[PDB]
C-alpha cells in the first residue's frame, strides 16, 4: 500500500502534459530528416576520396 | 570396348572428385567460422585432393590413346604434380590423425602446441616434405618409345639394373602407405581407448552411445584408406617382383587400381561432408 | 611515410601478443556455474574444497573457477545469456526437502527450466545430493510417497534414492546432447573434488571430440 | 623395363 | 481498493486523451516521400583481437576511437581507421555487460554482474591506464552506463533502477525508480538534459536528470525491451524488444508513432540506433545479422549479413561515417 | 616522473664509457627511450632511440657503429655504451621518454642529463633568427623553416616546439604544431604549413626566457633547429 499513493500521484502529475497531434509530430520528424538528409553518408555513399574507410 | 569403359571410369571419378572438393572449398572459404585448426587442415586436404584430381585427365587421355603425346615437359610436370599431391594428401591425413590424438588424449598440455600459426607452420612443413620426397619423380620422368613409335610417360630410372625400381617402390610403400597407416591406427586406437576409459564418470550409456559412432567413423576411414591404396601397391610390388606377361585383363586390373588410388581422394571429402556434425550445418 | 605510425603499429602488435598469451593462459582455466537450493546444502560441497563471488582453486593441474548464484536474486532468464558456453553447471540438491515445508516441486521446475533453455541446450550439469545423515532415518519414519504419488516401494536408500535420481535425470527433455550424471557426497573421503575433475575432464573430452569432426 | 610400374603402363 | 480504482481511472482517461489526438493516418503521410530504395554496405575493416564474446561497444566523440568489451575480461580501445589497438585494459570482473566512452575521451566506464561501475582514466601521466573510480550501490546488475560529462555518469541496473552519480565523490546524486522489472537499456538525449530507459515491463520511461521524476511512460511492447536509442532531433526514440518488433515513439505525441516488424523474423532485437539524419534505423537481430529500416516509411531497406553469430552491440559514429557491429563471433565489423 | 642520468665525466679519446638512465614513477616498459645530446655551446642533437620491447633501434649517422643503446625493463634502466669516443662527443646527454599511439605526446619528459667531456638526405630544420628583443607583457613570434614538407598524408604535421630555460632541462611546449603539452599555459600557440612554422606567445611573462627549438619527427634521424634565444 506504500506504493499506491506514489503511483497515483505520479500518474496525476504525468496526466497534465502537453500532447500534440500525431500528424504534427510525424511532420516534424519528416521535416528534420529532409533538412538533414544531405549530410548522411549512410544514405548516399560518399566517394572513396572523401571516405576515411 | 575395354578402353572406352576405363576412360569413362577415369572421367567420372575425376568429375566426382573435382565437384566434391570444389563444393567443400566453396563451403569452407565462404563461411567465416572455418578459421580453426581442423578447418584449415581440411582445407589443405581439399586443395591437395583438388590438384590430385586435376592431374588425372591427362592419364585418362594417355590410356585412351595408349600413348602419351603431350611432350616431355608436360609429362614431367604431370608426374611431379601427381607425386606432390599424393604425398601431400597422405601426410595431411597423418597430421590430422596425430593432431586429433593430441587434442583428445592430451587435452590440457596440448594448448601450447595447438595454435593457428603453428598449425600453418606444420602445414608448410608437410608441403615441404612432400616436395622433398618426390625428387626421383621430378628428376627421372620422361617419355619412353617402343619399336612401333608409341610413347608413354613414365619414370626413366638410370642404370640397366632393375634394383632402382624395387628400391623406389619399397621406399614409396614405406613412406606413403606403411608409416602413415600405422601412425593413424595407433592414434585412433589411443583415442578410442581414452574415450572408452572415461568410466570414472560412472555414467550410463557412456560405454555405447558416445563411442560406437567414433569407432565406426575410425573404422570407415582406415578401411577406405587401406582398400583404396593397398591394391595399387600390391600390383606394383608383384610387377617389380614377379615378371608377368601383359594381358588385356591384367591391363584392366592395373588401370582399375590406378583409378582406386584417386577414388580415395575422392572419398575423403565425402567422409568429411556426409559425416561431420559441425560442418554439415554450413 | 608512416613516421610514428610504425611505432603505433608495433605497440599494437606487442599488446596483441600479450592478448594472445593471456587468452592461452585462460584457456587452461575451467569455469563452473553453480546453482542449488537456498541455504540447504550449499555449505557442504563448498567445504570439500554483492553481485557474484568467484571461488578459485586448483586440483591436478586444472584451475577451477566457481561462480555461485546465491549472491543474486533476480529473473533467471535475464542473466542466462551471460553463462552460455560455460564448461558445466553444478546443481546441488538436498534430499531433506521431500518432507520440508514443497521444495522438490520448485527444484524440479527449475531443473526443467534450465535443461531446455535457448542457450543451455548443450551444456552439461553435474549434481550432488547431500544431507544423507538426515536421509538415513527420515525415510523409514516418513515414506517417500509424500512427494511421489506415482512411486511405491521399499523405504530404503538403495531404491527410494535410486527412484529420485532416475526422476531427476529424466527431468531433462533433450537427453541425447547433454549428459546428466551424479555423485554421492561423503563427509569423509573428500573425493568430491576428484569427481568434479573427472566430470569436467569427460566434458572437455566430448567437447573437443565433437569439435574435431566425426 | 617393366610393363607395369607406378601409375602408367608401358609396352616397352 | 478506492485508490487502485482511481489510478486505473486516471490511466483510462490519459489513454483516451492520447487516443483523441491520434489523427495519424500515417499511411497517407509517408506515401509522398520517395523511398530510399536499397542501400548496400560492406565490412571496410574487421577488428580481430577479442577471443571471447563481445557484449558492448561505444564510439568516441572523435569518431575514430571505439571501446569494446568482451567476456574474456579485457576491454580494448581501437583506432578504427588503422585497426590498431591503442589500449588493452584488463578489468577485474570478467562478466561485463556494458562499456562507455567519455565525450572528452579522457575516461572509459565498464560494468556488469559485479554491480560495480568501474571508471578508468586514459589520459594520465605514468603511462598505463588506472582505475579512477569504482561506483557502488546498485543491488541488481549494471546493464548500461552513459557519460554526461567527465564528472556525471548515468547508470542503469537490474534492480529496476537508474542512477546519476558524481565521479569525484562516487555517490548516487540522484535515483530514478519507477520500473517494475530489470532495466536493460539506457539512452541519453543529444542535449543530455533527459534520458529514456527500457525494462522488462515492456514500458519505456522518460526521466529528466535535474528533477528525478519520470516525465512520461510509454507502453505497447508485449515482451522485454533490450534496446533504446534517441532520435537525432531528441523528440523521439526507438525501442527494440524480444518479439522482433521495433517501435518508434514521439515524446510530444506520447504515443507509438511507428512499428517495424516483418513476418519472417521472430528472433529478438539486441541493439537499435539511428543514422545522423535519422532516416535509417539500424536493428541488430538475433538472426546473426542486422537490418536497416527506413524510419519514415517502415520498409526494410538493407541487411548487414556478415556475422557468424548473434550481433550483441551496434553503434553509429557521431559524424555518421560508419556503423560498428559487434557479435558473439568474437569480431566486430565496421560497415560504411 | 623522474629520469636520472649517470656515468659521465672525463674520458680519454678512443676510450669507452657507459651512460645509465634510471627511471622512476612511470611504466618504463611501455615507453620508447631516446638519447639526445647537446654540445657545450650549441643546440640539441639526436643520438639514439630504442622502442618498447627493444623491437626497434635507431642511431644517428655520426654515432652509428660506435654506440649501442639497450634497456633493462625489470630494473627500469636505459644504457648507452660508447666506444672510440672522440672530441666531437663532448656533450651533455639527456634521456627522453616517448610513447606512440593515436593522440599521444612523445618527447613529453626529459631527464636532467649528464656531462661527458672528452679531451682533445636528412631534413634540415633551418632556423633564421637567433635572438629577438624581449619585453614582458608583449607578444613574440618565432619562425621555423623546414627543407621538406612536414605535412603527411594522414594530416599530421610532425613538428615539435621545445623550450630550454637557462640551466634547465628542455620541456615540451607543442607537439605536432597545434597541440599544447600537459601543464603549459595557454599563452603558447603553434601554427603553420608544410615547410613554414610559427610559435606565438601572447602576454609574455617571466620564466619564458630561454632557447626555443623546433624538431621534426617525420623520419629518422630526428633533427633540431639551430635555436632562438629570447633575452631581456
Amino acid at each position: 500500500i506504500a506504493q499506491a499513493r506514489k503511483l497515483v500521484e505520479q500518474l496525476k502529475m504525468e496526466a497534465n502534459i502537453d500532447r500534440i497531434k500525431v500528424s504534427k509530430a510525424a511532420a516534424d520528424l519528416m521535416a528534420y530528416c529532409e533538412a538533414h538528409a544531405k549530410e548522411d553518408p549512410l544514405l548516399t555513399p560518399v566517394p572513396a576520396s572523401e571516405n576515411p574507410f | 570396348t575395354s578402353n572406352a569403359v576405363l576412360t569413362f571410369i577415369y572421367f567420372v571419378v575425376c568429375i566426382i572428385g573435382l565437384c566434391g572438393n570444389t563444393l567443400v572449398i566453396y563451403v569452407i572459404l565462404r563461411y567465416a567460422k572455418m578459421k580453426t585448426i581442423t578447418n584449415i587442415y581440411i582445407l589443405n586436404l581439399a586443395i591437395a585432393d583438388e590438384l590430385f584430381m586435376l592431374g588425372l585427365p591427362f592419364l585418362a587421355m594417355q590410356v585412351a590413346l595408349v600413348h602419351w603425346p603431350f611432350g616431355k615437359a608436360i609429362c614431367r610436370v604431370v608426374m611431379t604434380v601427381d607425386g606432390i599431391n599424393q604425398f601431400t594428401s597422405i601426410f595431411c591425413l597423418t597430421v590430422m590423425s596425430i593432431d586429433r590424438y593430441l587434442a583428445v588424449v592430451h587435452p590440457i598440455k596440448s594448448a601450447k602446441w595447438r595454435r593457428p600459426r603453428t598449425a600453418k607452420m606444420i602445414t608448410m612443413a608437410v608441403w615441404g616434405v612432400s616436395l622433398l620426397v618426390i625428387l626421383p619423380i621430378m628428376i627421372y620422368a620422361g617419355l619412353r618409345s617402343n619399336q612401333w613409335g608409341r610413347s608413354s610417360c613414365t619414370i626413366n630410372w638410370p642404370g640397366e639394373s632393375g634394383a632402382w625400381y624395387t628400391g623406389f617402390i619399397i621406399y614409396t610403400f614405406i613412406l606413403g602407405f606403411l608409416v602413415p597407416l600405422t601412425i593413424i591406427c595407433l592414434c585412433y586406437l589411443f583415442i578410442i581407448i581414452k574415450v572408452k576409459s572415461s568410466g570414472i564418470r560412472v555414467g550410463s550409456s557412456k560405454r555405447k552411445k558416445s563411442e560406437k559412432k567414433v569407432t565406426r567413423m575410425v573404422s570407415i576411414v582406415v578401411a577406405v584408406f587401406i582398400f583404396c591404396w593397398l591394391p595399387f601397391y600390391i600390383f606394383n610390388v608383384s610387377s617389380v617382383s614377379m615378371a608377368i606377361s601383359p594381358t588385356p585383363a591384367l591391363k584392366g586390373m592395373f588401370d582399375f587400381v590406378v583409378v582406386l588410388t584417386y577414388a580415395n581422394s575422392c572419398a575423403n571429402p565425402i567422409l568429411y561432408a556426409f559425416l561431420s556434425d559441425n560442418f554439415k550445418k554450413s | 611515410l608512416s613516421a610514428e605510425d610504425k611505432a603505433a603499429v608495433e605497440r599494437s602488435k606487442m599488446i596483441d601478443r600479450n592478448l594472445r598469451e593471456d587468452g592461452e593462459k585462460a584457456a587452461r582455466e575451467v569455469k563452473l556455474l553453480l546453482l542449488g537450493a537456498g541455504e540447504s546444502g550449499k555449505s557442504t560441497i563448498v567445504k570439500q574444497m554483492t553481485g557474484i563471488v568467484e571461488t578459485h582453486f586448483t586440483f591436478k593441474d586444472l584451475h577451477f573457477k566457481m561462480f555461485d548464484v546465491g549472491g543474486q536474486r533476480s529473473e533467471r532468464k535475464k542473466w542466462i545469456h551471460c553463462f552460455e558456453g560455460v564448461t558445466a553447471i553444478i546443481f546441488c540438491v538436498a534430499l531433506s526437502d521431500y518432507d520440508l515445508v514443497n521444495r522438490m516441486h520448485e527444484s524440479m521446475k527449475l531443473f526443467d527450466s534450465i535443461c531446455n533453455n535457448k542457450w543451455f541446450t548443450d551444456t552439461s550439469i553435474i549434481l550432488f545430493l547431500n544431507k544423507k545423515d538426515l536421509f538415513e532415518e527420515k525415510i523409514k519414519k516418513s515414506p517417500l510417497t509424500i512427494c511421489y504419488p506415482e512411486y511405491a516401494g521399499s523405504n530404503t536408500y538403495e531404491e527410494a534414492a535410486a527412484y529420485i535420481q532416475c526422476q531427476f535425470e529424466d527431468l531433462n527433455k533433450r537427453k541425447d546432447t547433454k549428459e546428466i550424471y551424479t555423485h554421492f557426497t561423503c563427509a569423509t573421503d573428500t573425493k568430491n573434488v576428484q569427481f568434479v575433475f573427472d566430470a569436467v575432464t569427460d566434458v572437455i573430452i566430448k567437447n573437443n571430440l565433437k569439435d574435431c569432426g566425426l | 623395363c617393366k610393363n607395369f610400374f607406378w601409375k602408367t603402363f608401358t609396352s616397352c | 481498493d478506492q485508490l487502485r480504482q482511481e489510478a486505473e481511472q486516471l490511466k483510462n482517461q490519459i489513454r483516451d486523451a492520447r487516443k483523441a489526438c491520434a489523427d495519424a493516418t500515417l499511411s497517407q503521410i509517408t506515401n509522398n516521400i520517395d523511398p530510399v530504395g536499397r542501400i548496400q554496405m560492406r565490412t571496410r575493416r574487421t577488428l580481430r583481437g577479442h577471443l571471447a564474446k563481445i557484449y558492448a561497444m561505444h564510439w568516441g566523440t572523435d569518431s575514430r576511437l571505439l571501446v569494446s568489451a568482451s567476456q574474456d575480461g579485457k576491454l580494448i580501445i581501437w583506432d578504427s581507421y588503422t585497426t590498431n589497438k591503442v589500449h588493452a585494459i584488463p578489468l577485474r570482473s570478467s562478466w561485463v555487460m556494458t562499456c562507455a566512452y567519455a565525450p572528452s575521451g579522457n575516461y572509459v566506464a565498464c560494468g556488469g554482474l559485479d554491480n560495480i561501475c568501474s571508471i578508468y582514466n586514459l589520459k594520465t601521466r605514468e603511462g598505463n591506464v588506472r582505475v579512477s573510480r569504482e561506483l557502488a550501490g546498485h543491488t541488481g546488475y549494471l546493464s548500461c552506463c552513459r557519460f554526461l560529462d567527465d564528472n556525471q555518469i548515468v547508470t542503469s541496473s537490474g534492480d529496476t533502477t537508474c542512477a546519476l552519480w558524481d565521479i569525484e565523490t562516487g555517490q548516487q546524486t540522484t535515483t530514478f525508480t519507477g520500473h517494475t522489472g530489470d532495466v536493460m537499456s539506457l539512452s541519453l538525449a543529444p542535449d543530455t538534459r533527459l534520458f529514456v530507459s527500457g525494462a522488462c515491463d515492456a514500458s519505456a520511461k522518460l526521466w529528466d536528470v535535474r528533477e528525478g521524476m519520470c516525465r512520461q511512460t510509454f507502453t505497447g511492447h508485449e515482451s522485454d525491451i533490450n534496446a533504446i536509442c534517441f532520435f537525432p532531433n531528441g523528440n523521439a526514440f526507438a525501442t527494440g524488444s524480444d518479439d522482433a518488433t521495433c517501435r518508434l515513439f514521439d515524446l510530444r505525441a506520447d504515443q507509438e508513432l511507428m512499428t517495424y516488424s516483418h513476418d519472417n523474423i521472430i528472433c529478438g532485437i539486441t541493439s537499435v540506433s539511428f543514422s545522423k539524419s535519422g532516416r535509417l534505423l539500424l536493428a541488430g537481430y538475433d538472426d546473426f545479422n542486422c537490418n536497416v529500416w527506413d524510419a519514415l516509411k517502415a520498409d526494410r531497406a538493407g541487411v548487414l549479413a556478415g556475422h557468424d553469430n548473434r550481433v550483441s552491440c551496434l553503434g553509429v559514429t557521431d559524424d555518421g561515417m560508419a556503423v560498428a557491429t559487434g557479435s558473439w563471433d568474437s569480431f566486430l565489423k565496421i560497415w560504411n | 616522473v623522474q629520469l636520472v642520468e649517470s656515468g659521465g665525466g672525463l674520458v680519454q679519446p678512443g676510450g669507452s664509457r657507459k651512460l645509465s638512465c634510471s627511471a622512476s614513477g612511470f611504466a618504463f616498459s611501455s615507453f620508447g627511450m631516446h638519447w639526445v645530446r647537446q654540445a657545450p655551446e650549441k643546440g640539441l642533437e639526436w643520438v639514439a632511440y630504442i622502442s618498447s620491447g627493444s623491437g626497434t633501434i635507431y642511431y644517428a649517422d655520426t654515432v652509428k657503429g660506435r654506440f649501442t643503446i639497450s634497456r633493462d625493463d625489470p630494473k627500469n634502466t636505459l644504457f648507452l655504451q660508447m666506444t672510440s669516443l672522440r672530441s666531437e662527443d663532448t656533450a651533455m646527454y639527456y634521456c627522453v621518454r616517448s610513447i606512440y599511439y593515436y593522440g599521444s605526446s612523445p618527447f613529453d619528459f626529459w631527464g636532467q642529463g649528464t656531462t661527458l667531456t672528452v679531451s682533445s638526405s636528412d631534413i634540415v630544420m633551418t632556423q633564421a633568427t637567433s635572438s629577438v628583443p624581449v619585453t614582458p607583457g608583449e607578444s613574440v613570434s618565432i619562425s621555423c623553416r623546414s627543407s621538406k614538407s612536414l605535412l603527411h598524408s594522414n594530416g599530421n604535421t610532425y613538428l615539435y616546439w621545445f623550450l630550454q630555460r637557462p640551466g634547465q632541462s628542455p620541456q615540451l611546449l607543442i607537439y605536432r604544431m597545434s597541440n599544447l603539452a600537459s601543464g603549459v599555459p595557454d599563452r603558447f600557440s603553434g601554427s603553420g604549413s608544410g615547410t613554414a612554422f610559427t610559435l606565438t606567445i601572447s602576454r609574455l611573462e617571466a620564466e619564458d626566457v630561454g632557447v626555443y627549438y623546433c624538431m621534426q619527427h617525420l623520419e629518422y634521424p630526428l633533427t633540431f633547429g639551430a635555436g632562438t634565444k629570447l633575452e631581456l
Side-chain angles (χ1 to χ4, degrees), chain A residues 1-2 4-5 7-8 10-11 13-17 19-39 41-49 51-53, chain B, chain C residues 1-21 23 25-38 40-41 43-53 55-60 62-74 76-96 98-99 102-108 110-117 119-132 134-140 142-149 151-157 159-178 180-187 190-210 212-214, chain D, chain E residues 3-20 22-27 29-31 33 35-125 127-209 211-212 214-232 234-307 309-336, chain F residues 1-15 17-40 42-50 52-71 73-87 89-119 122-137 139-176 178-185 187-194 196-206 208-230 232:
Chain A
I1 191 56
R5 176 171 289 98
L7 168 68
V8 74
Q10 187 277 150
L11 202 55
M13 74 185 185
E14 184 187 351
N16 42 10
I17 52 178
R19 314 171 205 251
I20 66 173
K21 299 300 182 300
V22 175
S23 68
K24 195 186 190 307
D28 295 331
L29 284 187
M30 187 184 62
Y32 180 90
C33 172
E34 181 270 354
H36 288 272
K38 300 176 295 300
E39 302 80 4
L42 299 187
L43 287 181
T44 66
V46 155
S49 183
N51 174 266
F53 294 101
Chain B
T1 301
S2 296
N3 198 330
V5 175
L6 309 164
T7 48
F8 284 176
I9 282 189
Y10 274 91
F11 288 158
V12 299
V13 67
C14 96
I15 291 301
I16 301 174
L18 286 178
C19 82
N21 281 283
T22 307
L23 69 88
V24 161
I25 303 181
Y26 193 90
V27 171
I28 295 179
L29 288 184
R30 190 55 186 174
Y31 287 73
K33 308 177 185 180
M34 306 295 101
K35 298 195 176 185
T36 69
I37 321 98
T38 303
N39 280 122
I40 66 176
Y41 281 150
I42 293 181
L43 180 66
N44 299 131
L45 189 68
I47 66 174
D49 290 330
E50 263 280 359
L51 300 177
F52 195 48
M53 214 70 264
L54 285 178
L56 184 131
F58 298 139
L59 286 179
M61 299 296 184
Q62 185 270 1
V63 171
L65 302 183
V66 201
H67 71 78
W68 177 273
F70 299 97
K72 175 194 174 182
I74 296 190
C75 160
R76 291 183 65 90
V77 300
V78 163
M79 290 295 99
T80 313
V81 71
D82 186 294
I84 182 80
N85 295 145
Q86 155 183 350
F87 277 85
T88 300
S89 290
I90 179 54
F91 279 105
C92 198
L93 282 181
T94 300
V95 294
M96 288 195 62
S97 274
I98 187 72
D99 153 82
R100 200 166 297 175
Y101 157 83
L102 283 179
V104 174
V105 179
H106 292 355
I108 306 167
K109 306 170 174 54
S110 52
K112 56 182 182 181
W113 266 331
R114 299 170 51 82
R115 292 191 165 187
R117 206 165 180 271
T118 304
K120 295 182 178 183
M121 187 194 77
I122 293 187
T123 291
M124 289 305 110
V126 152
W127 280 87
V129 174
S130 178
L131 181 54
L132 183 151
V133 294
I134 60 163
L135 288 182
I137 307 269
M138 66 195 306
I139 292 179
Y140 294 149
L143 273 303
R144 283 193 51 172
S145 304
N146 48 83
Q147 51 190 9
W148 304 345
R150 300 176 176 181
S151 192
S152 300
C153 173
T154 173
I155 303 180
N156 285 251
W157 275 102
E160 303 185 12
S161 69
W164 282 112
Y165 283 8
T166 300
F168 166 74
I169 190 196
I170 195 64
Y171 157 85
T172 52
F173 176 84
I174 294 182
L175 262 302
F177 181 86
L178 191 58
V179 171
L181 180 61
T182 182
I183 281 181
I184 288 182
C185 287
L186 282 198
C187 292
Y188 275 145
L189 163 77
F190 283 154
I191 281 184
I192 277 307
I193 194 181
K194 175 58 178 58
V195 171
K196 295 284 192 175
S197 176
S198 64
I200 40 188
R201 187 99 190 277
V202 306
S204 181
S205 67
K206 301 194 52 55
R207 319 289 184 165
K208 311 179 305 300
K209 174 196 58 185
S210 56
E211 35 284 320
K212 195 182 69 176
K213 182 185 176 187
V214 184
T215 299
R216 181 151 189 169
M217 190 76 175
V218 161
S219 185
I220 284 186
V221 174
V222 168
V224 70
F225 166 73
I226 293 182
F227 165 72
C228 288
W229 279 97
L230 186 63
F232 167 78
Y233 281 91
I234 287 183
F235 208 140
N236 280 15
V237 72
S238 60
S239 179
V240 306
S241 299
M242 298 295 177
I244 307 185
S245 300
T247 63
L250 211 62
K251 186 266 308 178
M253 196 178 178
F254 188 86
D255 58 61
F256 180 67
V257 312
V258 178
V259 174
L260 288 195
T261 178
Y262 294 75
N264 175 86
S265 155
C266 182
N268 259 127
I270 286 183
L271 287 177
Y272 293 98
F274 271 91
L275 304 175
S276 49
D277 280 354
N278 311 329
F279 193 87
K280 200 173 184 178
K281 306 182 180 184
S282 300
Chain C
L1 179 50
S2 313
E4 44 189 357
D5 311 335
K6 284 186 297 178
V9 172
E10 185 189 8
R11 165 187 177 91
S12 319
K13 290 202 301 291
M14 196 169 64
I15 72 188
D16 206 340
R17 160 166 69 255
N18 284 19
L19 272 176
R20 187 183 65 252
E21 186 177 18
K25 179 54 63 184
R28 276 151 272 194
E29 198 159 24
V30 52
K31 298 180 301 301
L32 295 170
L33 175 57
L34 183 137
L35 276 71
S40 77
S43 61
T44 298
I45 47 179
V46 299
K47 199 181 71 63
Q48 308 291 340
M49 70 292 296
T50 60
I52 48 181
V53 35
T55 59
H56 163 259
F57 63 93
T58 297
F59 181 82
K60 195 172 298 184
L62 196 53
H63 289 12
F64 296 84
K65 301 190 66 177
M66 187 186 311
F67 316 96
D68 50 351
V69 86
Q72 178 181 357
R73 281 82 64 175
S74 61
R76 289 165 288 279
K77 199 59 179 178
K78 305 308 174 179
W79 50 261
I80 217 65
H81 76 82
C82 329
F83 294 98
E84 190 273 351
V86 73
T87 295
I89 306 175
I90 303 178
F91 178 71
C92 174
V93 178
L95 278 175
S96 61
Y98 79 108
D99 64 325
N102 197 325
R103 297 298 307 275
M104 290 297 181
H105 311 76
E106 207 287 328
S107 66
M108 64 186 185
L110 170 62
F111 192 97
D112 180 24
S113 176
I114 195 182
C115 72
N116 312 314
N117 302 140
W119 317 111
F120 283 177
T121 170
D122 306 321
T123 177
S124 68
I125 43 188
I126 322 173
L127 61 97
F128 308 142
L129 298 90
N130 50 33
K131 277 190 172 181
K132 299 302 190 56
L134 287 312
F135 193 91
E136 294 175 1
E137 58 272 5
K138 291 221 305 182
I139 299 305
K140 178 186 297 180
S142 300
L144 201 62
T145 60
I146 299 180
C147 55
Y148 278 96
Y151 157 77
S154 60
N155 295 120
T156 52
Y157 178 75
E159 188 261 2
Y163 197 94
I164 298 184
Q165 292 178 277
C166 171
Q167 193 275 350
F168 267 104
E169 297 168 350
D170 194 20
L171 277 167
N172 61 340
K173 281 72 192 174
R174 183 172 180 87
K175 319 179 298 300
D176 310 339
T177 309
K178 41 186 293 178
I180 336 289
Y181 292 114
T182 310
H183 186 261
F184 286 142
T185 51
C186 309
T190 160
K191 55 185 178 180
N192 288 334
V193 290
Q194 173 74 17
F195 180 86
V196 172
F197 182 88
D198 295 331
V200 304
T201 295
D202 200 308
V203 169
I204 296 181
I205 291 312
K206 292 189 296 299
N207 276 126
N208 57 68
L209 203 60
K210 180 194 312 176
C212 78
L214 60 86
Chain D
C1 61
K2 268 68 159 194
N3 305 82
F4 310 98
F5 184 79
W6 192 237
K7 292 173 177 172
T8 54
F9 157 69
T10 313
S11 185
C12 183
Chain E
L3 205 158
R4 186 175 180 183
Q5 193 62 32
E6 212 290 326
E8 169 59 32
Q9 181 69 18
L10 283 184
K11 171 64 64 182
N12 193 22
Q13 78 98 352
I14 65 174
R15 186 261 303 176
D16 185 69
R18 76 156 57 99
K19 201 59 176 181
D23 57 352
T25 67
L26 197 45
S27 302
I29 306 184
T30 181
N31 72 270
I33 293 301
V36 72
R38 206 283 313 187
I39 82 171
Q40 179 71 22
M41 296 189 286
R42 288 174 178 82
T43 106
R44 307 303 193 188
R45 278 164 187 77
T46 293
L47 323 176
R48 44 177 74 257
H50 277 304
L51 71 184
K53 304 145 63 179
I54 69 200
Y55 280 92
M57 46 77 49
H58 197 238
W59 286 98
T61 43
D62 56 78
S63 178
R64 284 194 63 162
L65 302 164
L66 76 154
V67 58
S68 77
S70 166
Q71 244 177 208
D72 58 71
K74 311 184 66 176
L75 59 82
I76 47 204
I77 295 178
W78 304 87
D79 181 5
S80 166
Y81 287 179
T82 73
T83 327
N84 293 130
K85 308 197 212 311
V86 191
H87 299 93
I89 304 95
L91 35 86
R92 308 308 184 272
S93 73
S94 175
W95 318 85
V96 292
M97 313 279 201
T98 181
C99 65
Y101 214 149
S104 63
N106 287 272
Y107 302 88
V108 290
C110 197
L113 289 173
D114 52 317
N115 271 268
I116 308 290
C117 186
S118 295
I119 293 173
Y120 307 85
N121 186 18
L122 306 177
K123 303 181 178 183
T124 171
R125 288 188 152 278
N128 72 325
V129 297
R130 185 173 55 255
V131 191
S132 177
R133 299 295 291 173
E134 297 186 16
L135 315 176
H138 276 301
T139 60
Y141 65 93
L142 260 296
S143 180
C144 198
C145 305
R146 279 298 104 94
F147 268 95
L148 291 169
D149 317 310
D150 295 327
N151 193 27
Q152 290 182 132
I153 174 171
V154 45
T155 60
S156 154
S157 55
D159 58 4
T160 78
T161 39
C162 313
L164 192 152
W165 309 65
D166 269 1
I167 302 181
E168 294 298 331
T169 49
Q171 310 166 2
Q172 303 193 11
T173 77
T174 317
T175 295
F176 316 92
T177 158
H179 288 275
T180 66
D182 309 337
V183 191
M184 279 196 150
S185 39
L186 180 134
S187 184
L188 283 177
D191 50 313
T192 67
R193 197 68 67 84
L194 44 80
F195 66 96
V196 284
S197 58
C200 300
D201 321 338
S203 69
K205 295 205 171 188
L206 166 68
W207 317 84
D208 41 354
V209 293
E211 284 69 14
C214 45
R215 184 171 301 183
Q216 296 174 35
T217 297
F218 307 87
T219 58
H221 280 284
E222 301 170 346
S223 177
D224 190 0
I225 52 193
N226 305 272
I228 325 279
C229 187
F230 245 108
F231 194 85
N235 292 316
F237 64 97
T239 62
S241 49
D242 281 341
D243 49 358
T245 304
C246 298
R247 297 177 191 265
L248 165 73
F249 310 89
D250 194 305
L251 297 184
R252 288 170 291 184
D254 193 5
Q255 298 173 31
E256 176 181 358
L257 268 270
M258 193 100 55
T259 167
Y260 317 101
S261 184
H262 208 289
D263 308 67
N264 47 10
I265 39 185
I266 317 97
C267 282
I269 313 276
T270 309
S271 196
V272 155
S273 68
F274 282 100
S275 172
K276 194 173 192 303
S277 60
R279 184 54 178 270
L280 294 183
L281 177 63
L282 285 296
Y285 293 71
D286 215 278
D287 296 329
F288 322 107
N289 61 336
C290 308
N291 286 28
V292 193
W293 298 81
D294 196 317
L296 301 186
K297 207 166 299 300
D299 181 75
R300 180 195 296 179
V303 177
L304 269 55
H307 274 285
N309 204 328
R310 52 163 295 182
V311 285
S312 52
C313 28
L314 200 165
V316 178
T317 58
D318 299 63
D319 56 352
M321 288 289 183
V323 177
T325 72
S327 63
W328 288 9
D329 190 48
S330 182
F331 320 112
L332 45 159
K333 311 286 183 60
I334 298 177
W335 316 73
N336 210 134
Chain F
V1 287
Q2 186 77 301
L3 290 164
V4 185
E5 292 83 343
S6 179
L10 187 67
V11 162
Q12 306 297 333
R17 195 60 177 270
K18 170 179 291 300
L19 292 178
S20 184
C21 171
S22 179
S24 170
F26 66 106
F28 174 82
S29 53
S30 293
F31 283 77
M33 306 298 302
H34 303 249
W35 282 100
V36 173
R37 76 183 171 190
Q38 173 175 328
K42 305 185 191 60
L44 306 157
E45 179 194 6
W46 176 77
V47 165
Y49 158 71
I50 191 176
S52 291
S54 300
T56 299
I57 301 183
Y58 294 146
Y59 296 97
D61 301 324
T62 174
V63 312
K64 192 168 303 180
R66 302 184 292 104
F67 294 176
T68 289
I69 177 177
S70 65
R71 57 195 307 182
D73 298 358
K75 286 187 299 299
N76 297 33
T77 328
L78 181 75
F79 306 108
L80 183 68
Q81 170 68 43
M82 329 170 62
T83 59
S84 303
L85 284 185
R86 309 192 289 261
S87 64
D89 292 322
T90 303
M92 184 173 299
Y93 290 75
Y94 301 94
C95 172
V96 184
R97 67 188 261 254
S98 174
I99 186 170
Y100 303 95
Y101 49 84
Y102 172 73
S104 57
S105 164
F107 284 77
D108 65 334
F109 186 82
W110 295 54
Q112 296 305 125
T114 176
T115 313
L116 171 59
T117 38
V118 174
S119 176
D122 304 0
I123 306 187
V124 179
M125 301 301 299
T126 301
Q127 179 50 234
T129 300
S130 302
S131 178
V132 321
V134 186
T135 304
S139 301
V140 183
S141 176
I142 303 182
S143 181
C144 186
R145 181 64 45 182
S146 174
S147 56
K148 183 180 170 64
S149 184
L150 289 189
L151 187 139
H152 192 266
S153 62
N154 58 27
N156 289 121
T157 305
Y158 303 112
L159 176 97
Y160 294 71
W161 286 100
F162 305 95
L163 161 63
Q164 184 172 203
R165 296 183 177 92
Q168 280 299 332
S169 186
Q171 78 164 0
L172 177 70
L173 290 181
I174 287 182
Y175 57 96
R176 299 186 207 100
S178 294
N179 313 273
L180 280 74
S182 177
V184 301
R187 314 182 306 265
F188 297 86
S189 174
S191 51
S193 65
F197 314 100
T198 288
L199 164 76
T200 161
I201 310 174
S202 302
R203 293 166 289 97
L204 185 139
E205 298 283 358
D208 302 12
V209 157
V211 196
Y212 293 77
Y213 297 92
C214 49
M215 193 198 67
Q216 66 96 8
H217 214 291
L218 181 61
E219 51 184 8
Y220 292 87
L222 326 172
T223 46
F224 286 93
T228 299
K229 178 182 60 60
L230 301 200
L232 297 179

